[PDB]
Motif scaffolding. Structure first.
Motif, PDB file in Angstrom:
ATOM      1  N   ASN B  60      18.817  -5.059  -1.786  1.00 11.39           N
ATOM      2  CA  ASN B  60      20.122  -5.286  -1.200  1.00 11.39           C
ATOM      3  C   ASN B  60      20.494  -4.054  -0.394  1.00 11.39           C
ATOM      4  O   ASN B  60      20.695  -2.974  -0.955  1.00 11.39           O
ATOM      5  N   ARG B  61      20.535  -4.217   0.926  1.00  3.16           N
ATOM      6  CA  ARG B  61      20.974  -3.172   1.840  1.00  3.16           C
ATOM      7  C   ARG B  61      22.344  -3.509   2.420  1.00  3.16           C
ATOM      8  O   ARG B  61      22.443  -4.256   3.387  1.00  3.16           O
ATOM      9  N   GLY B  63      24.680  -5.537   1.465  1.00  3.92           N
ATOM     10  CA  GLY B  63      25.027  -6.946   1.466  1.00  3.92           C
ATOM     11  C   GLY B  63      24.128  -7.810   2.315  1.00  3.92           C
ATOM     12  O   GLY B  63      24.381  -9.001   2.480  1.00  3.92           O
ATOM     13  N   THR B  64      23.070  -7.211   2.852  1.00  5.79           N
ATOM     14  CA  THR B  64      22.018  -7.989   3.484  1.00  5.79           C
ATOM     15  C   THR B  64      20.806  -7.891   2.567  1.00  5.79           C
ATOM     16  O   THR B  64      20.392  -6.794   2.184  1.00  5.79           O
ATOM     17  N   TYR B  65      20.269  -9.049   2.204  1.00  6.18           N
ATOM     18  CA  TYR B  65      19.255  -9.128   1.170  1.00  6.18           C
ATOM     19  C   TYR B  65      17.868  -9.372   1.732  1.00  6.18           C
ATOM     20  O   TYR B  65      17.685 -10.153   2.671  1.00  6.18           O
ATOM     21  N   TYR B  66      16.903  -8.672   1.143  1.00  2.00           N
ATOM     22  CA  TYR B  66      15.499  -8.814   1.489  1.00  2.00           C
ATOM     23  C   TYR B  66      14.735  -9.110   0.209  1.00  2.00           C
ATOM     24  O   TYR B  66      14.957  -8.473  -0.816  1.00  2.00           O
TER      25      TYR B  66
END
Ligand SMILES: *C[C@H](NC(=O)OCc1ccccc1)C(=O)O
Lengths: 4, 212
Positions: B60-61, B63-66
């Motif tokens: 989680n960067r 609130g953008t998830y990988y």
């Protein structure tokens, strides 16, 4: 000591 | 300054989670991007649970998830033997700012001893600065890891910083930063354990990144  | 190094750490810290395919994500701790698609992460996050390689790893960067299959990350040791913290290549992560030159050099370790430091970390993404008392170096540090079932295992590494301080669950994976401005407030290593008002971080040196 514990994993934290 | 400590605060400017802290900002560089903060920008490279992501949340690390684990789950089964099609399952809920368990957010465990922090991982620290160091350069390109490489991160430092305590392997106690995943290595002691059953069939780890069939799990999905999550990053989680802000609130953008990988996400990626555990079998598709490349895990590289920092040194010979068990050191807990590993280097992990995650092909699907956005490139990190290279912060490897901000880590302490092996030869400068004595310069961080007996001085204050700051743990720059998060609890599930909420940034925190935790003061650590004058540092010592333990050639061998032992701590107890509680697995998901509730049972505990004992873990041991080479070269761990020990400082007085108050930690919380989820702070692992954050970076210890020296108060010593004469070594440019070097990043000393990665937080791995806390308890009884003591904080333990694995030493990570610049030289260790030579292992890719
Ligand atoms: C924090 C990074 N610092 C860095 O890599 O500095 C290397 C350097 C700086 C000054 C003189 C010689 C070498 C950064 O983002 O630049």
């Amino acid at each position: 000591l514990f994993f934290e | 300054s400590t605060l400017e190094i802290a900002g560089l750490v903060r920008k490279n810290l992501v949340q690390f989670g684990v789950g089964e395919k099609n399952g809920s994500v368990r957010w465990v701790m922090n991982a620290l991007g160091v350069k390109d698609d490489w991160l430092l992460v305590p392997s106690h996050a995943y290595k002691f649970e059953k069939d780890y390689e069939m799990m999905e790893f999550y990053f989680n960067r802000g609130g953008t998830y990988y996400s990626i299959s555990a079998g598709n990350v490349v895990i590289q040791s920092l040194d010979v033997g068990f050191q807990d913290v590993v280097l992990m290549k995650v092909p699907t992560i956005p490139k990190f700012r290279d912060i490897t030159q901000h880590f302490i050099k092996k030869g400068d370790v004595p310069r961080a001893l007996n001085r204050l430091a700051t743990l720059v970390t998060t609890v599930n993404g909420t940034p925190m600065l935790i003061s650590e008392g004058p540092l010592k170096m333990e050639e061998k540090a032992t701590y107890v890891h509680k697995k998901n079932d509730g049972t505990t295992v004992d873990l041991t590494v080479d070269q761990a910083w020990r400082g007085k301080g108050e930690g919380l669950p989820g702070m692992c994976g954050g970076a210890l930063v020296s108060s010593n401005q004469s070594i440019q407030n070097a990043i000393l290593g990665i937080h791995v354990a806390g308890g009884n008002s003591i904080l333990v971080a694995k030493l990570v040196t610049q030289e260790m990144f030579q292992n890719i």
